[PDB]
Design an enzyme around this catalytic site. Structure first.
Site, mmCIF file in Angstrom:
data_model
loop_
_atom_site.group_PDB
_atom_site.id
_atom_site.type_symbol
_atom_site.label_atom_id
_atom_site.label_comp_id
_atom_site.label_asym_id
_atom_site.label_seq_id
_atom_site.Cartn_x
_atom_site.Cartn_y
_atom_site.Cartn_z
ATOM 1 N N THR A 1 -102.003 2.136 -35.260
ATOM 2 C CA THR A 1 -102.059 2.986 -34.295
ATOM 3 C C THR A 1 -101.589 2.278 -32.720
ATOM 4 O O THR A 1 -102.316 1.386 -32.453
ATOM 5 C CB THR A 1 -103.661 3.089 -33.986
ATOM 6 N N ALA B 1 -108.039 10.864 -36.848
ATOM 7 C CA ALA B 1 -106.622 11.963 -37.083
ATOM 8 C C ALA B 1 -107.199 13.337 -37.018
ATOM 9 O O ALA B 1 -106.461 14.103 -36.201
ATOM 10 C CB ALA B 1 -106.265 11.466 -38.636
#
EC number: 3.4.25.1
Lengths: 249, 208, 204, 220, 195, 242, 212, 241
Positions: free
Chosen positions: G1, G49
């Site tokens: 990320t 997500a």
């Protein structure tokens, strides 16, 4: 018995002894008012066409929108009561967009036509046991010209009563009965796109009060490749003079 | 929740002409053993049974409605004695989807439900479901310590799908009854009592 | 932390011969700080007075709602409010909120314009009507004032003779309290006139 | 109270170039207790789709039963339209996201053919994230067989003999007999060093002609 | 941290701010305009938990513009400051509150006297000549009652503030990347340019 | 014609709602009510129909009313439907003060309280109020004020009005002698003359009437809702030489 | 990320990783993290997500039927807000969005906005979020300028993220680079790290205290 | 007849009547007018002053303003006028909150209309005997705009309009004096086109007029009575003939 229509007329939910209820049959008479419309389908392109009822020389006639976009591959017309349109189409598009979520694909055209017709039926129970939202069944008789992969280019006639049809060459509104016979006898199954735009700019001439120009009319044509577009004025005036250059010879 | 009057294990097995399931007859309060007159087997029709474990307060709640389910079948179907009657698959899904919609509500039933019976064609049926609603099937099943102790045993009699018609009733009853011996020999809360149910696709049903 | 032990305010009431006396403190602030020298913790509605303690929101918010009402009870019944109803109103106007309540030690004071009588009372946060006659208090420093007010108040007192026993009861206590005491204020009341005095003490 | 626990299983499923498959264990366990020996996990959900729910069992079945039922309302409404996979990519995003605050402890995968005849399998979270892959596995034994695929399927982490650093070996769209011979080596390459898996093998071969399914056996 | 402060004077009013945002470890942005222009002769400035800060102000100003629009005679701060808390007095006891604290400065006209108000995330309203929030006023409830008397001029503020800031950034362990300042008077709001 | 009179949402073809106008003749049955706007303090006034002898017409004011220390009202219409919307007004003014901590202006509640009388001439099987008012106020933005509210919802600001019965003359008599300065005590001596000269009786007693006064006239400026008692209209009444 | 985006006179840029991580072992490395909601706007899916891409997706629809009816295109000051208004009425419930919005228009010029579950949004010039956001700053924050050129940017996005994988495990896989302007969002490729690392090593000559 | 009572039910023609009967109620109310050039939009309204006691500083002004960049007029009856505005301006102000970009005017008029097409759906509710005129620019654009609403629930765009009493005189007066492809290009000219549009029907008064204009930069202004008397009287010279 002669008082069969005189008394059983006004309440929606009154069967008359002839079997029929009238207050829907009058809704059908509304869209006979308003300004006419046409829809012709082809293996190559769907096309529409309308008059506009020039009411005053100072209005800005891009405003009254007898034709609309509703999605990138669908487009509508309407020859009826106006204000009861914008309650329709702000539902009809909303399915197509909603459908693009729950199923991620360009919706078919008939299902949209089945969602509408399951909306005007709300002077009663809809499909899924719903109850009511109105009492004024409204005259917005549509023409839903669209494309989808299963069956190609289509149009429909969606009426307040709910029941619809896949016409191939339709014309609704005030200039119908003089037209829908005229289109009865000049629809091949092997026309072009531009063998139709001129046609629908010939019937529209003879049927309408005023003469024909760019100002008192327009039209549209979807295509699987480009999409719904409402043609331009100078583009339309191209076709109008083209016609005369065909008539005299 | 959290239960008080919790029951104990049951046992099952399939065989050639039918199935066998049985339980014990006991009502607990803890270590104590208060009631010993109860049953664990609620027949339904003449093809089907249901064994129960877990909270006896809820076992009373199951039998209350199954008797009503069959009752509301009989409403307006004169045909429904012969072929349009309750075979087990007509049942078990009611005792499965009740539970998942009773789990997600968060007030579940801490029973552990076993179902046995036969269809109308004649084939075996057996299935199971705990409080959470999970389901499965195999030729022999149990609950609680019965599955941690006696399921391995009876699978020695019936290994897998092949050897099911390599079997009969007299050999079948003479296995679980020896598993009954184990639980009364070692199980903490068991009792000497017993309650048997056999089914046969030809001779039908009988009871303790 | 408790709500009642945050900002800090002390109030006093005391009966006298055809006179009463009510007072309050002016300090206000967060925990372990002070912001304003000037917050009149005491109020008045009609001839009837009132004083509040505790959390400042539920000071400022009780002023308004009681002011929303007595300006109706005057219009509706063509007569001012007198205390012995007002003292009941503040009970049931707080006991409706037994759960998710306000955090206040109230007081009240006034004369009953019919019998020329004096009157005071105190309360808790859900409406227990205490009807002491000599005096009544509230605030953070109650335990630091029930002692140094008991020994000082006789019965049947005279206004200025009753005045100076409020202040000294009010000053020698607030000077010991931990969360109070930037300037004070007092009211002495008679049947038909009122006056406001401030008082002098320390500062920061 | 605990509303959901564990049941085991470990699944995987692949797309070829003009086909795909899906594989799943055939055992159910509670707490090192063989709850059963043969209970299936993978279902032809109509319109030649296969999917699987590996993890908690009930949620792994109730999710399906809503998908077998959504698929038919898609036919009743839209006149027998065949339901593509792109649709079920984000349809299933919704069935699950309808439970974000009491969710489905399930790892769903799907297998099907797209419009251009190619195969593809999608993976999911338990809370509705739709992604695409071609090599995928899930369950408890999922961190233990994927690295056998990248070194075989996608030939990752191995250059070609002759250069020692420069050139990577080429790629080929594996055939069916490669995959079944491969996955049939996978679980036999796991069940001996792992406990929850074993007792069966359900491959769901999908092709244009329709659906097949083969079965084999392992060490109880 | 997220400091804020303001000063009253004889002929106008001043308010200050910070310029810093910190979310986790990283200091994102250095030019956050932490005010909203309710009305021309009135202004507020707010501090608190992220999200709860912003859309409190846009909520109420939309109500204050709505009162200026129809009466066409704007309303004094003392009707604002009494109003603003009336959201918060009922916001704290509600389900999700608004952990914000604010200043309000302006200039009532009919008197030609300015005002100032200090309000917290509970409802404690009171006017001061000087004020602040957070762990700032610990450093500055001491200067502004020594180097402050009420007969000043506008330039005294920034000059009495350009050092007051120094007292903070000389002690305050948290960067705050400076400050914008703006002023209120008859000719309306005026933002300063440099410091 | 096909009679369009039966609901207040029917719209006769000429465009006019009949069942509103009816209310505007349900008001003529009422008892007159007058207010003149001075230069240094408004006056109001009134008159009653029923004045039998054995009923306490001393303390009971039935028309004149207050809303707060700034504002006063004089009603003309049905009485069942005055309590309904004069407690509401009180309850509106306080619930403005309570949350802006300054006093109510007149042009707010008259604007509000009239839209209420429009919320009933439009929807439901409801009726419109038979009511009118004569407001009398003060506020910083404009100071002295006078206002009026029909049973429709339409309001207008004025300088001197009579409502109720026989306003025709009582405007006519008024508009041809209302000077524009009109010190307060010179206003009262006008209002009585109108009622003296417009009514049906000839007695014009002290019991039949009540007339109040707003006054800024004090030093250390503030407002004074001065209502007059029976004992001092008599001084007003002998002083004129009726 | 680890993601980012930034401005310059030419356009707007977007750069991302491709991680799919969990606990202490990776679930995948082939995930898109910039949502093709429509041809003129784009947004990142960092943080949770699914909690993101159910709602950016959603926002593609409202912005679509915001177009059809007033018949022009929607601004961006809209989209950053209604997504903000939306989430604030869910907080305190367990939703974990952290992302931004990216758009160029004819009226606001370029425009960028942040957004998160906590319910704020702020205009910017550079943003970067994830786990190794601080590693991203040091590269560009020392280097870029609003008068910068193009191909340096598309390179600057490669390097400004690439310091992540060399320093972090939870941010790697492959890189995806977009370039936005009035005509639309322009793709510039998926690029893997193990094939890019060895390139930039010899070329840039960075990683001075490292093998190769 | 029988079909001319309610809203739910149709003629045996198609006409729905009550809506047609409201518009008869418009015409029992004072005029109004709206003109646009290129750098300006204007509005007019013939008021009354037929009473002397009535104070005149708060004169009944048809005009209302929804925001800074928008104005309004009406016709019909005014008990309802106060409503639509009080919901209109709410909606403009609950838009920039929700969006921080003010209203495209086409967004506003679809909410003044929308409140009329809900009060023509169900019996038990009455329509609005009213008909508006909008005038205002967008933010960050120059194109001058003007619509009108109407209780049928419809609306159209207009370069010049006149509604209220004796409008059937003023329209054709504006069909000559205008030309869509060469508008007035100065803030004086629209007013002069607009004033003499009132002078046909207004007994050559000048105290009986109100004009209010609008421009960019959130500009609006009402004009002065003495600024009209010279916009009035200078015309009278120009019909010295």
């Amino acid at each position: 018995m002669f008082l069969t229509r005189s008394e059983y007329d006004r309440g929606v939910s009154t069967f008359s002894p002839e079997g029929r209820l009238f207050q829907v049959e009058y809704s059908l008479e509304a869209i006979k008012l308003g300004s006419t419309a046409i829809g012709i389908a082809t293996k190559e392109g769907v096309v529409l066409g309308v008059e506009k009822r020039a009411t005053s020389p100072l209005l800005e006639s891009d405003s009254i929108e007898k034709i609309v976009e509703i999605d990138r591959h669908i487009g509508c017309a309407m020859s009826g009561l106006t204000a009861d349109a914008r309650s329709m189409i702000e539902h009809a598009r909303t399915a197509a967009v909603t459908h693009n979520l729950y199923y991620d694909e360009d919706i078919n055209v008939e299902s949209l036509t089945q969602s509408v017709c399951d909306l005007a039926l709300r002077f009663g129970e809809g499909a899924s046991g719903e109850e009511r939202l109105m009492s004024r069944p409204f005259g917005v008789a549509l023409l839903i010209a669209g494309h989808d992969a299963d069956d190609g280019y289509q149009l429909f006639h969606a009426e307040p009563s709910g029941t619809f049809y896949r016409y191939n060459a339709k014309a609704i509104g005030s200039g119908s009965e003089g037209a829908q016979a005229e289109l009865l006898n000049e629809w091949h199954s092997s026309l072009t796109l531009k063998e139709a735009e001129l046609l629908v700019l010939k019937i529209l001439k003879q049927v309408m009060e005023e003469k024909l120009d760019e100002n008192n009319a327009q039209l549209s044509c979807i295509t699987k490749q480009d999409g719904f577009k409402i043609y331009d004025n100078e583009k339309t005036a191209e076709l109008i003079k083209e016609l005369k250059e065909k008539e005299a010879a | 929740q959290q239960p008080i009057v919790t029951g104990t294990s049951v046992i099952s097995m399939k065989y050639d002409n039918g199935v066998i399931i049985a339980a014990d007859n006991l009502g607990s309060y803890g270590s104590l053993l208060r009631f010993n007159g109860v049953e664990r087997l609620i027949p339904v029709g003449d093809n089907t049974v249901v064994g129960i474990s877990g909270d006896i307060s809820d076992m009373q709640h199951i039998e209350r409605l199954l008797k009503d389910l069959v009752t509301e079948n009989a409403y307006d179907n004169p045909l429904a004695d012969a072929e349009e009657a309750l075979e087990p698959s007509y049942i078990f899904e009611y005792l499965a989807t009740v539970m998942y919609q009773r789990r997600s509500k968060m007030n579940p039933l801490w029973n552990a439900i076993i179902v046995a019976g036969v269809q109308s064609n004649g084939d075996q049926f057996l299935r199971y479901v705990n409080l959470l609603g999970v389901t499965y099937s195999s030729p022999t099943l149990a609950t609680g310590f019965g599955a941690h102790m006696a399921n391995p045993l009876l699978r020695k009699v019936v290994d897998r799908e092949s050897d099911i018609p390599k079997t009969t009733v007299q050999v079948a009853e003479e296995a679980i009854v020896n598993a009954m011996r184990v639980l009364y020999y070692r199980d903490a809360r068991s009792s000497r009592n017993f309650s048997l149910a056999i089914i046969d696709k030809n001779t039908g049903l009988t009871f303790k | 932390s408790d709500p009642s032990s945050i900002n800090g305010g002390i109030v006093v009431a005391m009966t006298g011969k055809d006179c009463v006396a009510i007072a309050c403190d002016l300090r206000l602030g967060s925990q372990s700080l002070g912001v304003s020298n000037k917050f009149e913790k005491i109020f008045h509605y009609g001839h009837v007075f009132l004083g509040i303690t505790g959390l400042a929101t539920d000071v400022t918010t009780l002023n308004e709602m009681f002011r929303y009402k007595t300006n109706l009870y005057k219009l509706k019944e063509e007569r001012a409010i007198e205390p012995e109803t007002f003292t009941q109103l503040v009970s049931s106007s707080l006991y409706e909120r037994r759960f998710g309540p306000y955090f206040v030690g109230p007081v009240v004071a006034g004369i009953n314009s019919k019998s020329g009588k004096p009157f005071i009372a105190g309360f808790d946060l859900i409406g227990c009507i205490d009807e002491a006659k000599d005096f009544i208090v509230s605030g953070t420093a109650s335990d630091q004032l029930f002692g140094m007010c008991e020994s000082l108040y006789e019965p049947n007192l005279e206004p200025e003779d009753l005045f100076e026993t409020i202040s000294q009861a009010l000053l020698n206590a607030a000077d010991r309290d931990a969360l109070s005491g930037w300037g004070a204020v007092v009211y002495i009341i008679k049947k038909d006139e009122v006056v406001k005095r401030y008082l002098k003490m320390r500062q920061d | 109270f605990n509303p959901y626990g564990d049941n085991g299983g470990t699944i995987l499923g692949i797309a070829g170039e003009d086909f795909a498959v899906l594989a799943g264990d055939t055992r159910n366990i509670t707490d090192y207790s063989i709850n059963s020996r043969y209970e299936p996990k993978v279902f032809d959900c109509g319109d030649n789709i296969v999917m699987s729910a590996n993890g908690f069992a009930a949620d792994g079945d109730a999710l399906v039963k809503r998908f077998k039922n959504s698929v038919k309302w898609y036919h009743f409404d839209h006149n027998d339209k065949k339901l593509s996979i792109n649709s079920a990519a984000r349809n299933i995003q919704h069935l699950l996201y309808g439970k974000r605050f009491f969710p489905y402890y399930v790892h769903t995968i799907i297998a099907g053919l797209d419009e251009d005849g190619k195969g593809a399998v999608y993976s999911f979270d338990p809370v509705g994230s739709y992604e695409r892959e071609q090599c995928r596995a899930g369950g408890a034994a999922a961190s233990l067989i994927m690295p056998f695929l990248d070194n075989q399927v996608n030939f990752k982490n191995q250059y070609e003999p002759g250069t020692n650093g420069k050139v990577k070996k080429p790629l080929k769209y594996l055939s069916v007999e490669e995959v079944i011979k491969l996955v049939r080596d996978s679980f036999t390459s796991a069940t001996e060093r792992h406990i929850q898996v074993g007792d069966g093998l359900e491959i769901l071969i999908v092709t244009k002609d329709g659906v097949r399914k083969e079965f084999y056996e392992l060490k109880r | 941290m997220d400091i804020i402060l303001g000063i009253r004077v004889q002929d106008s009013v001043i308010l200050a701010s910070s310029k810093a945002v910190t979310r986790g470890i990283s200091v994102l942005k250095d030019s956050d305009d932490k005010t909203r222009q309710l009305s021309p002769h009135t202004l507020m400035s707010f501090a608190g938990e992220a999200g709860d800060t912003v859309q409190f102000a846009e909520y109420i100003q939309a109500n204050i513009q709505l009162y200026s629009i129809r009466e066409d005679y704007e309303l004094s701060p003392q009707a604002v400051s009494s109003f603003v808390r009336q959201e918060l007095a009922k916001s704290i006891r509600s389900r999700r509150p608004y952990q914000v604290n604010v200043l309000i400065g302006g200039y009532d006209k009919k008197k030609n006297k300015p005002e100032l108000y200090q309000i917290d995330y509970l409802g404690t309203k009171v006017e001061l000549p000087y004020g602040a929030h957070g762990y700032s006023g610990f450093y500055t409830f001491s200067l502004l009652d020594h180097h402050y008397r009420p007969d000043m001029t506008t330039e005294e503020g920034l000059d009495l503030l350009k050092l007051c800031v120094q007292e903070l950034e000389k002690r305050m362990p948290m960067d705050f990347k400076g400050v914008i300042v703006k002023i209120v008077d008859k000719d309306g709001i005026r933002q300063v340019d440099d410091f | 014609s096909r009679r369009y009179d039966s609901r207040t949402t029917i719209f006769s073809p000429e465009g006019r709602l009949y069942q509103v106008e009816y209310a505007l003749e349900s008001i003529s049955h009422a008892g007159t009510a007058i207010g003149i706007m001075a230069s240094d303090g408004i006056v109001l006034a009134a008159e009653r129909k029923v004045t039998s002898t054995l009923l306490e017409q001393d303390t009971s004011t039935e028309k004149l009313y207050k809303l707060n220390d700034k504002i006063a009202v004089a009603v003309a219409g049905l009485t069942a439907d005055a309590e309904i919307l004069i407690n509401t007004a009180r309850i509106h003014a306080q619930n403005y003060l309570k949350t802006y901590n300054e006093d109510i202006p007149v042009e707010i509640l008259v604007r509000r309280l009239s839209d209420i009388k429009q919320g009933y001439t439009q929807h439901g099987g409801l009726r419109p109020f038979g009511v009118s008012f004569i407001y009398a106020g003060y506020d910083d933005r404009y100071g002295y004020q006078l206002y009026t509210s029909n049973p429709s919802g339409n309001y207008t600001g004025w300088k001197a009005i009579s409502v109720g019965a026989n306003t025709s003359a009582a405007q006519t008599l008024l508009q041809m002698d209302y000077k524009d300065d009109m010190k307060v005590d010179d206003a009262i001596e006008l209002a009585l003359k109108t009622l003296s000269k417009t009514t049906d009786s000839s007695a014009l007693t002290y019991d039949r009437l009540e007339f109040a006064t707003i006054r800024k006239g004090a030093n250390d400026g503030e407002v004074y809702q001065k209502i007059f008692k029976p004992q001092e209209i008599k001084d007003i009444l002998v002083k004129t030489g009726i | 990320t680890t993601t980012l985006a930034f401005r310059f006179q030419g356009g707007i840029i977007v750069a991302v990783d491709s991680r799919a991580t969990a606990g202490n072992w990776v679930a995948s490395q082939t995930v898109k993290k910039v949502i093709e909601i429509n041809p003129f706007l784009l947004g990142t899916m960092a943080g949770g997500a699914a909690d993101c891409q159910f709602w950016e997706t959603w926002l593609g629809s409202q912005c679509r039927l915001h177009e059809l009816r007033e018949k022009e295109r929607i601004s961006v000051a809209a989209a950053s807000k209604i997504l903000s208004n939306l989430v604030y009425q869910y907080k305190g419930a367990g939703l974990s969005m952290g992302t931004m919005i990216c758009g160029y228009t004819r009226k606001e010029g370029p425009t960028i906005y942040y957004v998160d579950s906590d319910g704020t949004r702020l205009k910017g010039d550079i943003f970067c979020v994830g786990s190794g956001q601080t590693f991203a700053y040091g590269v560009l924050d020392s280097n870029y300028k609003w008068d910068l050129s193009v191909e340096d940017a598309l390179y600057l996005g490669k390097r400004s993220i690439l310091a992540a994988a060399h320093r972090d495990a939870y941010s790697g896989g492959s890189v995806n680079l977009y370039h936005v302007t009035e005509d639309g969002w322009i793709y510039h490729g998926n690029h893997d790290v193990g094939e890019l690392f060895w390139k930039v090593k010899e070329e840039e000559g960075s990683f001075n205290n490292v093998i190769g | 007849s029988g079909y001319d009572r309610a809203l739910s039910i149709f003629s045996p023609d198609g006409h729905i009547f009550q809506v047609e009967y409201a518009l008869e109620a418009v015409k029992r109310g004072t005029c109004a007018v709206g003109v646009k050039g290129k750098n300006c939009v204007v509005l007019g309204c013939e008021r009354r002053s037929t009473l002397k006691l009535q104070d005149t500083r708060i004169t009944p002004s048809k005009v209302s303003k929804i925001d800074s960049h928008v104005v309004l007029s009406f016709s019909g009856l005014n008990a309802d006028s106060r409503i639509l505005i009080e919901k209109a301006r709410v909606e403009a102000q609950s838009h920039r909150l929700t969006l921080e970009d003010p209203v495209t005017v086409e967004y506003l008029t679809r909410y003044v209309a929308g409140v009329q097409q809900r009060y023509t759906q169900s019996g038990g509710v009455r329509p609005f005997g009213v008909s508006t005129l909008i005038a205002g620019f967008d933010p960050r654009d120059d194109e001058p705009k003007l619509y009108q609403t109407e209780p049928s629930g419809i609306y159209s765009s207009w370069s010049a309009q006149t509604i209220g009493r004796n409008s059937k005189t003023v329209r054709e007066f504006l069909e000559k004096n205008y030309d869509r492809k060469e508008p007035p290009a100065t803030v004086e000219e629209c007013v002069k086109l607009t004033v003499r549009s009132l002078l046909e029907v207004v007994q050559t008064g000048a105290k009986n007029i109100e004009i209010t204009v609008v421009k960019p930069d959130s500009d609006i202004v009402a004009l002065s009575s003495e600024e009209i008397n010279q916009y009035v009287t200078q015309i009278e010279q120009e019909k010295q003939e």
